[PDB]
Symmetry: C3
Subunit: 219 residues, 3 copies
């Protein structure tokens, strides 16, 4: 019941960071590393992991002992961590971007380049296809197919607001959009390129910008 | 050739699911025995391991006494299909493009940032696949086409007898368009931004709309 | 600056294509001579190399009898345009955003995961570029805008005399919309989800549809 409130609380607690991986060489036994940097070094070479705010002044301080370095970096002032994928009972392909507090059901499939925002829920056996986007709290049922490039609009604030809810066995075409708070009924089909602005009854096909009922199917 | 779609499904059935990790660690490593299943680049002090999580996890547990600290880097979970080795291809592929094995990239093609090429996709000579575009399984693009940003060319892996999307030479497709399964877009045709193409496009015609219709013949 | 578009094209023509690799290797490395074209971090046993594949590939072959094993990491092929250093920017850029050099990101802008910013793109102060959105070459967004997930703002690199997409302040654009080349969206306008904007949008109007039309004055 308090999920949406606890998401906003988690976000407000999250600490902005600019995490870097540094490879370096030099007279590293002469170097003094602070507790703030995770360091993996021998006397000759090393690998450092840490926030740029700690690493930058560190490199400046030891410039005379460090011969050369490379800094790798992916993000800036980013607070929300990404989800640990290593133990999930599902399939997540490389280039998928999944934030913390996302729920991925058993034997779901998250394709290359899909993006799952905080609070997103993916039911068991569901495919989120390539480049698809699940906004904050967007909720997908079981054995659904969310087409390549489709956007399910996000709803973080206000926490009392209903997120997008995709019921079971839904197929949504490529590059469609489902707007905030819209419910797509069980077994329904949303055509490629549709913009779904109101609830879709179970077992109907909708299509168009904006989507209209085009057909009622018998399963 | 004629067996290509069959050979794709066979390659996928043969692919082994893996949770590849990169581990940076330190400790008493001369006292550590690494198993055959892990690639390891170490001194007696620090080191880097590449392996499947199913091997690396029980390893890290088995050697907890000797391992002082570690970091695990991971991108994918239970992913079976390898990505394409880009290094020797006679084309341009920008960072963030996600390209699976068994994709065919013609001479002097350009694959922009964030484009996603699924297994079996074919990109002809001189073609640009623009930012965030998606080529589904077996989607075939001719020579000197421009596939606009965010465009989805629908995938057809199964059944193998099904025709894929075929884009003929010199076609330009607008941003965030969709071409549905098995559709042929004729030579020199133009597809407007945001169109959903549901049936074959004649050569040298412009189509537009959701669903797309013929809007003018080009001379 | 009046020269901006010309200078972007100059910068591209000057960028050198590269196939950058990171190589982890092990072997008898004290016996190896690493050329000055490769950045090298090694002890006698193991090392890390950074360099262009054109230099690293014949180096690996020349030294195969000394190198026991290696792993090559690579991201790109024949890529010339560098990416933007994010580290000192006064803004928020999330992981997986792809942002080229000569992109301007204003104070407390937000660049969400998977957004794509091409060379010349300008993002104004307090503007959000949402997940999966694409700013084409020279696309210009004002202050306190919201560019919705999956939206494409069309690019204009050549000809340099052509106007880019210009989004004025306080604009909201819905998900998976498209703004075509040279189109100006007026202050405080709303573009509906899925719209294709083919012509200028008046300030404080709502436009919708494929092609977009005025549906409301706000
Ligand atoms: Cl797959
Ligand atoms: Cl969101
Ligand atoms: Cl380019
Ligand atoms: Cl596909
Ligand atoms: Cl955020
Ligand atoms: Cl562009
Ligand atoms: Mg997209």
């Amino acid at each position: 019941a308090m999920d949406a409130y606890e998401i906003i609380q988690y976000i407000g607690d999250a600490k902005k960071q600019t995490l870097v991986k540094v490879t370096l060489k030099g007279q590293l036994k002469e170097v003094t590393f602070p507790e703030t940097i995770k360091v993996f070094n021998n006397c000759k070479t090393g690998t450092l992991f840490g926030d740029w705010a700690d690493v930058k002044p560190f490199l400046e301080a030891n410039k005379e002992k460090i011969e050369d370095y490379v800094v790798e970096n992916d993000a800036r002032n980013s607070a929300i961590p990404f989800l640990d994928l290593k133990d999930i009972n599902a399939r997540i392909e490389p280039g998928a971007l999944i934030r913390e507090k996302v729920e991925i059901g058993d034997q779901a499939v998250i394709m290359m380049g899909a993006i799952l925002n905080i609070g997103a829920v993916v039911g068991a056996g569901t495919m989120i296809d390539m480049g698809a986007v699940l906004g904050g709290r967007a909720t997908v049922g079981k054995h659904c197919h969310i087409g390549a490039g489709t956007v399910l609009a996000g709803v973080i604030e206000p926490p009392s607001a209903a997120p997008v809810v995709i019921e079971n066995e839904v197929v949504i075409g490529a590059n469609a959009v489902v707007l905030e708070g819209v419910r797509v009924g069980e077994g329904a089909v949303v055509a490629a390129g549709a913009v779904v602005v109101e609830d879709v009854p179970a077992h109907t096909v909708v299509a168009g910008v904006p989507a209209k009922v085009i057909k009622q199917i018998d399963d």
